[PDB]
Design a protein around this ligand. Structure first.
Ligand SMILES: O=c1cc(O)n([C@@H]2O[C@H](COP(=O)(O)O)[C@@H](O)[C@H]2O)c(=O)[nH]1
Ligand SMILES: O=c1cc(O)n([C@@H]2O[C@H](COP(=O)(O)O)[C@@H](O)[C@H]2O)c(=O)[nH]1
Lengths: 220, 218
């Protein structure tokens, strides 16, 4: 009972121009039915961009807003985001259990989903997040979180996070391609990989997506 | 940064009409407004320019920036394009993520505020134990503007100690979350106040009342 992500591949659509974002997403639509829309695009083009993607592509939308405020403000952010049509929202765990619970409560009321971001993929994640990440994941399990985000760039950490959350939980993983993570290796542990620049900066985004999928064909 | 009455309005109403009306009602008391995602995600980034057109106030974009460096850069660019004077960034994701924001702020003539410890109970779980180190990281990176919690004055005082008297420190959690205006201003340069003003029956009277209570500190 998890979202059915086509080809185990989620597009990170971080282009900031509406025309470019729509063009590239349309070009890879035959390969991907799940799109992650973040603040680069939303802050540039408005929350209606979620509406426009739904209208144009009929793709699931994960709002990557890394929600990281106090409970009251988290609640408001989730309400606005789901009102706009996002299927799911990504929330940081490091601000603690009350902040996460606030998001879960809105998601439950509104019939949508929360993804909990545990450890991040970039080098700076080692300073503070990494040391808290196993406990953040365990906290997620205790709170009944079913969907998680963890880093492609650290296979050993991604493996441990998978263990903590169990095989029934849903796990998606960014850092594939541009940041150095390998698609196949990452899919040993993650249900789906998130890929941005390797696709959307390619001369032919469809060929780039098709190439990634070909490389993991035996895992589909 | 010179904040009128040491008081920053946290404008978290999610309706444009109410947000503009309430801000107008307290305009004589403030010249600095913190705008966050509740308002921006409901009404659009154009609300920032509208506030600058109507009030001339400085605008702090409270976006709790907490992504990887590449994405942080993009978020800061979009935010400053919309006319924000400053942006609030989480320190927990580490130094490279903060530096990405500092770079864009320098390029566009803006300021970064580094959020160290947060004001809500959940901050005790992970953030509090990292907060002193996050503040030292800010010092190492040349950060001059910081955010810390009204709800824990002993922690706010420690943050002030780490960053020094020359750094600028603003503090939320005043009023609704339990923090005291005057006590907070022992350590912070300015207090952030949301619900105590914008949910008050009479927001202007609420603002005036807070200012009366700290008049000897102005
Ligand atoms: O730990 C994380 C969590 C993320 O959401 N992301 C997001 O995943 C995407 C990665 O894109 P890319 O494939 O271009 O590196 C970006 O949108 C980024 O904000 C990440 O890179 N690392
Ligand atoms: O630690 C923090 C950091 C914040 O930015 N904030 C923000 O400050 C404001 C506090 O508003 P209020 O006075 O209604 O509690 C909110 O916009 C909130 O998101 C906070 O409450 N605690």
């Amino acid at each position: 009972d998890v979202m059915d992500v086509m080809n185990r591949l989620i597009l990170a659509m971080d282009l900031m121009n509406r025309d470019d974002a729509l063009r590239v997403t349309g070009e890879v639509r035959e390969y991907i039915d799940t799109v992650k829309i973040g603040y680069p695009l939303v802050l540039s083009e408005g929350m209606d961009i979620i509406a426009e993607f739904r209208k144009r592509f009929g793709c699931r939308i994960i709002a990557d807003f890394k929600v990281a405020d106090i409970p009251e403000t988290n609640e408001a952010i989730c309400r606005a985001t789901f009102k706009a049509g996002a299927d799911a929202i990504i929330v940081h765990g490091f601000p603690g259990a009350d902040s996460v619970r606030a998001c879960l409560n809105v998601a439950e009321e509104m019939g949508r989903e929360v993804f909990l971001l545990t450890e991040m993929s970039h080098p700076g994640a080692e300073m503070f997040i990494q040391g808290a990440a196993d406990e953040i994941a365990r906290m997620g399990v205790d709170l009944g979180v079913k969907n998680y985000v963890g880093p492609s760039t650290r296979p050993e950490r991604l493996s441990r996070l998978r263990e903590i959350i169990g095989q029934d939980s849903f796990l998606i993983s960014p850092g594939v391609g541009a940041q150095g993570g390998d698609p196949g290796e990452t899919l040993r542990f993650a249900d789906a990989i998130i890929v941005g620049r390797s696709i959307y900066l390619a001369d032919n985004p469809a060929a780039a997506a098709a190439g990634i999928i070909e490389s993991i064909k035996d895992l589909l």
